[PDB]
Amino acid sequence: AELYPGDIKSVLLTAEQIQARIAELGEQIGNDYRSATTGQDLLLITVLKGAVLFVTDLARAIPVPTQFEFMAVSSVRILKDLDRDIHGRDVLIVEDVVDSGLTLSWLSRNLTSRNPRSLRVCTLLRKPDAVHANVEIAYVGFDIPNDFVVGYGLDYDERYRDLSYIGTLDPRVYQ
Amino acid sequence: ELYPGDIKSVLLTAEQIQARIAELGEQIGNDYRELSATTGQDLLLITVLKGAVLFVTDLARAIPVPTQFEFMAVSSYGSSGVVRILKDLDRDIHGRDVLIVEDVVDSGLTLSWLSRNLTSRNPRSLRVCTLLRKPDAVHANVEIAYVGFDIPNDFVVGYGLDYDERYRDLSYIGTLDPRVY
Amino acid sequence: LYPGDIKSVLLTAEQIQARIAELGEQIGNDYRELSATTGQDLLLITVLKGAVLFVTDLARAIPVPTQFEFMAVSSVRILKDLDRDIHGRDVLIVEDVVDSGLTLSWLSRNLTSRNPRSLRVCTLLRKPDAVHANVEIAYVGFDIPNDFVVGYGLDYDERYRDLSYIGTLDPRVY
Amino acid sequence: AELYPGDIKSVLLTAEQIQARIAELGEQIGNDYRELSATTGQDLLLITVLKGAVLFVTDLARAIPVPTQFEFMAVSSVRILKDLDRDIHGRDVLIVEDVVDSGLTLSWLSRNLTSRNPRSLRVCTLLRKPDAVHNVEIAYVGFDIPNDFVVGYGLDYDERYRDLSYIGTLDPRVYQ
Numbered sequence A: 001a002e003l004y005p006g007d008i009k010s011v012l013l014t015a016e017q018i019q020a021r022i023a024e025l026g027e028q029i030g031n032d033y034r035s036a037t038t039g040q041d042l043l044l045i046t047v048l049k050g051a052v053l054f055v056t057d058l059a060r061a062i063p064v065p066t067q068f069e070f071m072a073v074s075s076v077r078i079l080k081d082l083d084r085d086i087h088g089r090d091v092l093i094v095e096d097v098v099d100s101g102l103t104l105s106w107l108s109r110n111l112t113s114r115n116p117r118s119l120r121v122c123t124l125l126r127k128p129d130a131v132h133a134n135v136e137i138a139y140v141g142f143d144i145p146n147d148f149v150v151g152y153g154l155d156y157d158e159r160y161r162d163l164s165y166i167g168t169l170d171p172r173v174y175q
Numbered sequence B: 001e002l003y004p005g006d007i008k009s010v011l012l013t014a015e016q017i018q019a020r021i022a023e024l025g026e027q028i029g030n031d032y033r034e035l036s037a038t039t040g041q042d043l044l045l046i047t048v049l050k051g052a053v054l055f056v057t058d059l060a061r062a063i064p065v066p067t068q069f070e071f072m073a074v075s076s077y078g079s080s081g082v083v084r085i086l087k088d089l090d091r092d093i094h095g096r097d098v099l100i101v102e103d104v105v106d107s108g109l110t111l112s113w114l115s116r117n118l119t120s121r122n123p124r125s126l127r128v129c130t131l132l133r134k135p136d137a138v139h140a141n142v143e144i145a146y147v148g149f150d151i152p153n154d155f156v157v158g159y160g161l162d163y164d165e166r167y168r169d170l171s172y173i174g175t176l177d178p179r180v181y
Numbered sequence C: 001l002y003p004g005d006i007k008s009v010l011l012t013a014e015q016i017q018a019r020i021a022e023l024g025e026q027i028g029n030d031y032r033e034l035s036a037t038t039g040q041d042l043l044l045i046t047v048l049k050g051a052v053l054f055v056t057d058l059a060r061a062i063p064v065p066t067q068f069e070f071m072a073v074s075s076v077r078i079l080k081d082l083d084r085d086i087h088g089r090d091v092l093i094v095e096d097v098v099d100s101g102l103t104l105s106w107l108s109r110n111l112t113s114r115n116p117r118s119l120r121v122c123t124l125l126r127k128p129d130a131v132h133a134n135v136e137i138a139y140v141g142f143d144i145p146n147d148f149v150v151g152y153g154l155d156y157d158e159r160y161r162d163l164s165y166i167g168t169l170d171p172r173v174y
Numbered sequence D: 001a002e003l004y005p006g007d008i009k010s011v012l013l014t015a016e017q018i019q020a021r022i023a024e025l026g027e028q029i030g031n032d033y034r035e036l037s038a039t040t041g042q043d044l045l046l047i048t049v050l051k052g053a054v055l056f057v058t059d060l061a062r063a064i065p066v067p068t069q070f071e072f073m074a075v076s077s078v079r080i081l082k083d084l085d086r087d088i089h090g091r092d093v094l095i096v097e098d099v100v101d102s103g104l105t106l107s108w109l110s111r112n113l114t115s116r117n118p119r120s121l122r123v124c125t126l127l128r129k130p131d132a133v134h135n136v137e138i139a140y141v142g143f144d145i146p147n148d149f150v151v152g153y154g155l156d157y158d159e160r161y162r163d164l165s166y167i168g169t170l171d172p173r174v175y176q
């Protein structure tokens, strides 16, 4: 039975497909960061709110010790900063989607100014307009078309985040 | 294994946690079955960072009614300073039906402060769902509608629970080797 | 420059005034239409000496007429009693800190036996034992940990009451 | 936005006028007691006369840069209603009043407290009326005001208007 009956037009990524890719990502990320030298765990900086489901599944798929951080930014200003000093830490930005790349471009500049040991980016979704941006993304879950999607953290007006899958919305929803 | 030697024993396995959460989700779903149809708004989950993050993402997926995510963080009783909001809610909860989602209730001091703070914002309803509950919570004064597990007083880590920010990423909940703590 | 026995600042002057403004406006909304009905002003009962700074700033933040009364109790007996009868009056007990809840419990019992129309409590600070004991308090400025604090009416052996801020006393003296 | 709509006819002293003057008094009192208090190692005792001087003393004490302590007294209209909980022998004591008018309250209280033999006694009043500019030396005077009856900032009419942040005169209809 549909959680939001009639609201989802079509499925883009099943729950099974999402988890399988996250398993792959975690192993790849674990490979690249395999704390024995530095003595400090990989730092996952989650961009609230869309990336919260992604990061909890991803962290459990990463076979090395990881720590959680949470940020929230607007459409350039910080609503919610780090409770952490990332100086000398290995940092991984965890996003749900990169579209224009504006959020990432801003977040990359902010975090790198705090002088971390390293900074990399992991996003679940990447849309075609990200081509025009210039911040390297080491880890990408899926490349998708330009359409507006919801589910698995992705919202429309704070709704549909709780979906286990990702899909597009019926036009009637925006009304 | 993630932390070789650090974990002494496993209190709750990954499957046991997920199985219980599925039970909780269904129970909560039944209690709020008509919420979206009656009020026109979804059940609001207020997650207390950072310990409850893993819990709430699994819980929300286990709840068969529409749920909305909000997150907040409060300071510690420990000189930790006055009890205060470190990270505030994004949306207004006025007239909303709210479920406080916690990882563990122990002394009940955090929940008491949270309950008073959120109540003053006048939600339609306010209830509590915690994954773990310790024996000292019996002296606490805030009603808890949903509890995953009652556990002993021993210090545990995993599935959101930390020791100095470590061990949150474990899929299970376990006790720590005294060499650490 | 801070006095030597001040370890750290728990609450700055600005933080205190900011919260008092919130409490003042809240108290005003709670008693505005009520006071207009009875024709009598809201009565503030100050517990000397700790709550004296708190009550003068609070009263000036409360947008409805308020009257002052002062009481002083021991650590059992009444050192200073009320100057007027509070029968049928709306009374707000004003304290600096509620800890064990012992003082508030005794005062409430003593004041309710004078039959005021309403008897409510406003404290600037509250320590965890008051939370455990589930002490009913209508207005609370701040929840604080068990650490001994001075300033803004709060004292250590009658000292430091005149500080504009609330600071954590250096554990090297208490 | 008036606390007492129509009751206040005029404003004699604004809130910022009172606070500006208190800041000056606190700085003056501080300079006069700085080296003086360090010799004894004991704080200056502020003896407050209830209830009118309560607003004043809380702002004044915060304006005084040297350490101070609070005491409170209540007298009739002369006997003691609330007495000192404390012996002030050898202490430096500053009487804090809201207004000195006839001077009879201050005169009686000054001799009563000197009979407890403090190391030094001084008087500080926020307001002084013309017949008080004349028994007791007042080292610190906030304002010299006319004889007119005023309320606010601790000053009451029938226990009302104490909570006003300013000092002003009442409309004659209030006396009905």
Ligand SMILES: Nc1nc2c(ncn2CCN(CCN(CC=O)CCP(=O)(O)O)CCP(=O)(O)O)c(=O)[nH]1
Binding pocket: A047, A048, A049, A050, A051, A072, A073, A074, A075, A096, A097, A098, A099, A100, A101, A102, A103, A104, A127, A146, A147, A148, A149, A150, A154, A155, A156
């Ligand atoms: N739900 C959804 N959101 C979409 C989509 N495309 C872009 N976005 C906007 C995602 N974000 C919105 C940023 N926004 C505030 C910044 O953190 C997200 C807050 P949220 O995760 O709580 O929804 C823009 C990425 P970019 O354009 O800067 O690269 C989409 O298909 N679905």
Ligand SMILES: Nc1nc2c(ncn2CCN(CCN(CC=O)CCP(=O)(O)O)CCP(=O)(O)O)c(=O)[nH]1
Binding pocket: B048, B049, B050, B051, B052, B073, B074, B075, B076, B103, B104, B105, B106, B107, B108, B109, B110, B111, B134, B153, B154, B155, B156, B157, B161, B162, B163
């Ligand atoms: N990791 C861990 N933490 C434990 C445990 N028992 C109590 N706690 C303290 C959990 N909490 C700590 C509160 N603390 C700040 C409040 O949000 C948690 C922040 P965190 O979730 O980021 O770790 C106390 C609950 P209470 O005593 O007020 O009812 C335990 O066995 N393991």
Ligand SMILES: Nc1nc2c(ncn2CCN(CCN(CC=O)CCP(=O)(O)O)CCP(=O)(O)O)c(=O)[nH]1
Binding pocket: C047, C048, C049, C050, C051, C072, C073, C074, C075, C096, C097, C098, C099, C100, C101, C102, C103, C104, C127, C146, C147, C148, C149, C150, C154, C155, C156
């Ligand atoms: N200065 C200071 N005092 C503290 C503190 N914690 C408890 N107390 C003692 C508070 N006591 C004060 C009682 N005692 C006589 C009653 O008015 C204080 C007189 P005072 O205000 O003139 O200093 C009551 C708290 P409770 O346990 O009865 O609820 C603290 O951190 N600082």
Ligand SMILES: Nc1nc2c(ncn2CCN(CCN(CC=O)CCP(=O)(O)O)CCP(=O)(O)O)c(=O)[nH]1
Binding pocket: D049, D050, D051, D052, D053, D074, D075, D076, D077, D099, D100, D101, D102, D103, D104, D105, D106, D132, D147, D148, D149, D150, D151, D155, D156, D157
């Ligand atoms: N509210 C008000 N009161 C005024 C005024 N002028 C003299 N007073 C009388 C002030 N006091 C009244 C004394 N009275 C009892 C003694 O403490 C004041 C009690 P209170 O502060 O609670 O109102 C007389 C000073 P004096 O004539 O002996 O030098 C005035 O303009 N407004």
Ligand SMILES: [Mg+2]
Binding pocket: A047, A048, A049, A050, A051, A095, A096, A097
């Ligand atoms: Mg995002």
Ligand SMILES: [Mg+2]
Binding pocket: A050, A154, A155, A156, A157
């Ligand atoms: Mg969004």
Ligand SMILES: [Mg+2]
Binding pocket: B048, B049, B051, B052, B102, B103, B104
């Ligand atoms: Mg918690």
Ligand SMILES: [Mg+2]
Binding pocket: B051, B161, B162, B163
């Ligand atoms: Mg913790």
Ligand SMILES: [Mg+2]
Binding pocket: C047, C048, C050, C051, C095, C096, C097
């Ligand atoms: Mg007190």
Ligand SMILES: [Mg+2]
Binding pocket: C050, C154, C155, C156
């Ligand atoms: Mg005391």
Ligand SMILES: [Mg+2]
Binding pocket: D049, D050, D052, D053, D097, D098, D099
């Ligand atoms: Mg007087």
Ligand SMILES: [Mg+2]
Binding pocket: D052, D155, D156, D157
């Ligand atoms: Mg009078």
